[PDB]
Each structure stands twice: as structure tokens, then as C-alpha cells.
Amino acid sequence: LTEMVKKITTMNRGEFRQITLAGKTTELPRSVIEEIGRHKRVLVLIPLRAAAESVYQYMRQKHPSIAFNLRIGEMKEGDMATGITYASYGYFCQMSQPKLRAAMVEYSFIFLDEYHCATPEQLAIMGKIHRFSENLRVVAMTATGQKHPIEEFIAPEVMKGEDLGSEYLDIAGLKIPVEEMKNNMLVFVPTRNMAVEAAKKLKAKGYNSGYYPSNLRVVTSQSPYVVVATNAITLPDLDVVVDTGLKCEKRIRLSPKMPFIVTGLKRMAVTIGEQAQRRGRVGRVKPGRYYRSQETPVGSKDYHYDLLQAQRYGIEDGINITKSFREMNYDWSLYEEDSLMITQLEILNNLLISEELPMAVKNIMARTDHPEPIQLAYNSYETQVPVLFPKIRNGEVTDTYDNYTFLNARKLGDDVPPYVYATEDEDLAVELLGLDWPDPGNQGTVEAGRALKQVVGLS
């Protein structure tokens, strides 16, 4: 739209704008560049590398009159490319704060696409560029298809040992009318284990069930079908959706007792948006039915675990990513905030960067397949030796261990390490084995804990 372009094109350096109107990532920057001029540099940040590639490919074909650039690999030295530059946020994560600023200042406009995804690279770049925001023109964009009526239902929860008539059946803990099994059903469940258990039970009852891609084609090719899936992106002639309203997602637990940081998957409610995408699977080609649990959706994505992961990208430059997030969010108002949480996270982020990271640790983090390398960085403040904790199966300690590369790790044994950062399954092992986590062993960790106690107190 013309008015929006006029508004963005008149922005002065140091200004920020938030847009919701869904052309977006394609037609909005295109219109802006045609207005500002073809030779002016315009940057469009996209979360996924493959997504950035897709747009670049599409746009260069569609508009030959405008120049397009793709930035998803290695750093282009002295990059001065003229058209619209489509880049991943991770592309800019490679650069030092001075280098990043030098690069960023050259673009006339910077477009932040799909900021609601809140990936660690995304959170780090937003916080980092905001540091020199006075020098930029930043535009944050978001998009926050039913052709037939959707009938909505609240399915009651099936109680343990409840005897449903010949009229109802258990669909992932929800009481669904049996007459619904004559239709094409999609069931949303939080876990992979539940998708398999729900599918296998329905198959045993005689239903054409499958779980979640080529091995679903055998199910979906015959109707009626029932497909049990976790949060996903074919499903022909879909009639009904059964939504558990739940998802499995990483979460953080902050405490003044060490380990101060505890992370892992936890079952939680989906967001309003997620629920809308789940209900949106029906009413597209024919009428639909949507059965939801009594579970209330949350308003927004919990970015805390990703914020903690983002902190890594500020280590080399000695930047506190949480402080940067907070300062940025104040000016830009993109995300909801939990002030106690951000405070705690900032106290720990100061610890993370309080000292130069040991070369040994720096080198392990670079090469390891370990899913949370930041754990190594935080723990370096107390220990240099990574510890292999026994794996938890069902709710019991086993003799299985995760084998991550380049760790030079040691088995837990009876020796609990002084971890600053632990996983839910590491903490569980400690408790199940009747062992205790050590208390802070140095001024740094001691004061960090004292500061944490203090905040939870004034909370």
C-alpha cells in the first residue's frame, strides 16, 4: 500500500516502525526500493536460510528491473551490493560488533521479517543493532484462509477408568463422539510418544490410523483416515481436527540456589496463533469441525530459552545480550516482558561475560555437537571438565549416557560437579540418586546468587 510506503520512505535516521499489513517480505521492500531508488541498498532479514534463498529466487525472476542479493553463507568482504539484500540473521552473527555496525549503516532501510519467531540469532541481532539504532531506519514486519464454516466444540477430558458409551471414544485424552470416525480426522498431540500410542490404539480398534511422510500416503490415500501429529506444516479431504491444545517446548527455571539455570522440554499450552493454525487446517475446501480441550491458549511465544541461547552471540564482544534485548524491547515494544525473569537473566548474563572464556572451552563449543554449548561457557565459571550424567528413562536413572563430540567428558559417578547451568534430566539424576549440587565456590558465583536471592525477594 502507497500510504505505508510514503510513511516508511519519509523516516529519518534513528527511527523505528512496526508494520502488520500482510505483499509483506516481497512487495513492501520492492515498493520501498522503487520509491527510494534502484541503486539504494535495502536489507530484509529472514529467520531461515532456506526461506531467504526461496524469496531471493522468486523475486529475481519476478522483478528483473530490480537487483537482488542473497546473504546466507560466508561473509562477503566489503559488500556494497545495490538492490534488495535477502539475508538470514545468522549471516550477521559471524561479524564483530564494529564490523556489524559498519555493514548495517550502509543500508537505507532494514526490514525485520517475522520477528514473532524469536530465534536466538534473531534476538541477538535485534539487541545488537539496537545498540546503534540512532544510525538506522528499522522496520519490523509481521502477519499476526477459511472459505467454509467451522463448527467449534470443547471436548471434555476422559477420566481414568471412565466408561464411555458405544457413543464416544478416547482421542488423546479427549471424549470425542464415535460418529466422528466416519470422517477424515487430524489429531494434534504434544509428544511423539503420544502420536505413536494414540495411532497404535486407534489401529487396534479398527480405524485407518497413522502418525507423524511417504508412509502417511498409504493412510491418507483411503478414507476415512485418522492422522495423529505433533505441531506440523498434505491431508486430502480433511473434515475434523482434534486439538489437545498442548505442545512440548524448551523452558528455563531460574534460582538463587546453584545451578542457577535449569533447562529442558516441558508440556505447555499452545498460543492463540498456534491454535488458529491448528483450527485453520479445516474449512478450507469444504465445511469443517474443530474439537479443542478445556486448555486455554497463551498470548505469546515464551522467548526465555531462546534469549538464554542468544547470550552466546555476545561473548566475543563482551556484550550482555539480555541487557541489549531489554533496551531494544523498551524502544521497539515487539515482545511481552516478564521483568523478574529478564532481571535474573541479565544478572547471570553479566556473570557469563565477567571473564575471558578459556581457549579450551572456546574450542570445544566451536566443534561440539552438544545442543546447548552455552552450558559449557556458564559452567566454566566453576568447572572445566564436562560431566556425563546418566540418561533418564520413564522416570528412572539408567546406565545410558549421551555421547557429544569433543567434550573429553567424565561420567557423573557419585561426584556431582559444581554446575551453574544444568538440564532437567541432569537435576533429576542428582535427586533420584540422593546426591546434592555444590554451593557457589567463588566470589563471582556467590555474588551472582546473592543478587538473585535479592530479586526474588523484592518479587
DSSP annotation string for 78-137: T----SEEEEEHHHHTTS-HHHHHHHHHT-SEEEE--GGG--HHHHHHHHHHHTTGGG--
Q: Are 220 and 235 in contact (CB under 8 A)?
A: yes
Residue labelled with grid coordinates 531471493: 56
* Other C-beta atoms lying within 10 Å of the C-beta of residue 116: 19
DSSP 8-state code for residue 355? S
Q: Is 245 left (phi over 0), alpha (psi -120 to 50) or beta?
A: left
Ligand-binding annotation for 25, yes or no, is yes
Give the residue among 86, 39, 89 at the shortest CA–CA distance from 309.
89
Q: Are 291 and 176 in contact (CB under 8 A)?
A: yes
And the C-alpha cell for 78? 566489503
Identify the helix (H) or strand (E) that includes residue 171: strand 168-171
How far apart (Å, rounded) are the C-alpha atoms in residues 459 and 442?
Answer: 26
DSSP 8-state code for residue 297? P
How far apart (Å, rounded) are the C-alpha atoms in residues 168 and 179?
Answer: 8
Examine residue 224 and say whether the peptide bond preceding it is cis (omega within 30 degrees of 0): yes
Ligand-binding annotation for 310, yes or no, is no
How far apart (Å, rounded) are the C-alpha atoms in residues 173 and 189?
Answer: 10
Q: Are 86 and 70 in contact (CB under 8 A)?
A: yes
How far apart (Å, rounded) are the C-alpha atoms in residues 68 and 80?
Answer: 12
> Bridge-partner residues for 110, per DSSP?
43, 138
Ligand-binding annotation for 169, yes or no, is no
DSSP 8-state code for residue 311? G
**Burial group, residue 35, by CB count within 10 angstroms (0-12, 13-18, 19+):** middle
Q: Which long-range contacts (CB under 8 A, 24 or more apart) does 295-298 make?
A: 295/244, 295/245, 295/246, 295/269, 296/245, 296/269, 297/245, 297/269, 297/270, 297/271, 297/272, 298/268, 298/269, 298/270, 298/271, 298/272
Tell me how many degrees the CA angle 322-336-233 measures, rounded to the nearest 5: 100
DSSP 8-state code for residue 266? E
**Burial group, residue 147, by CB count within 10 angstroms (0-12, 13-18, 19+):** exposed
And the C-alpha cell for 422? 544444568
Residue labelled with grid coordinates 566451536: 366
Residues 6+ apart with CB under 8 A from 195: 187, 189, 211, 212, 228, 229, 230
Coil, helix or strand for 226? strand
Count of alpha carbons within 13 angstroms of residue 287, beta-carbon side: 5
Ligand-binding annotation for 191, yes or no, is no
User: Greatest CA separation found in the chain?
Assistant: 72
Q: Which long-range contacts (CB under 8 A, 24 or more apart) does 113-117 make?
A: 113/24, 113/25, 113/44, 113/45, 113/46, 113/47, 113/141, 114/25, 114/46, 114/47, 114/141, 114/142, 114/143, 115/140, 115/141, 115/142, 115/334, 116/142, 116/144, 116/273, 116/300, 116/301, 117/47, 117/301
Q: What does residue 42 show for φ and ψ, rounded to 5 degrees? A: -130, 125
Give the residue among 252, 289, 290 at the shortest CA–CA distance from 268.
252
Report helix angle 321-332 to 120-130, nearest 10.
70
SS3 content of the chain, % helix, strand, coil (to 5): 35, 20, 45
Residues 6+ apart with CB under 8 A from 198: 171, 172, 187, 189, 209, 211, 228
How far apart (Å, rounded) are the C-alpha atoms in residues 82 and 233?
Answer: 35
Pairing state of beta strands 109-112 and 42-46? parallel
Coil, helix or strand for 223? coil
First-to-last alpha carbon distance for the chain, in angstroms, is 46
Ligand-binding annotation for 23, yes or no, is yes
Give the residue among 393, 394, 396, 436 at the shortest CA–CA distance from 412.
436
> Which method, experimentally, gave rise to this model?
X-ray
Instruction: Write b or e for each residue in 343-373: b if 16 or more Cβ atoms lie within 10 A of its Cβ, otherwise e.
Output: bbbbbbbbbbbeeebeeebbebbeeeebebb
- What radius of gyration do the chain's Cα atoms show? 25
**Burial group, residue 155, by CB count within 10 angstroms (0-12, 13-18, 19+):** buried
Which amino acid would we find at residue 291? Answer: Y
Q: Which long-range contacts (CB under 8 A, 24 or more apart) does 114-119 make?
A: 114/25, 114/46, 114/47, 114/141, 114/142, 114/143, 115/140, 115/141, 115/142, 115/334, 116/142, 116/144, 116/273, 116/300, 116/301, 117/47, 117/301, 118/301, 118/303, 118/306, 118/335, 119/47, 119/89, 119/306
> Bridge-partner residues for 388, per DSSP?
411
Residues 6+ apart with CB under 8 A from 9: 32, 35, 36
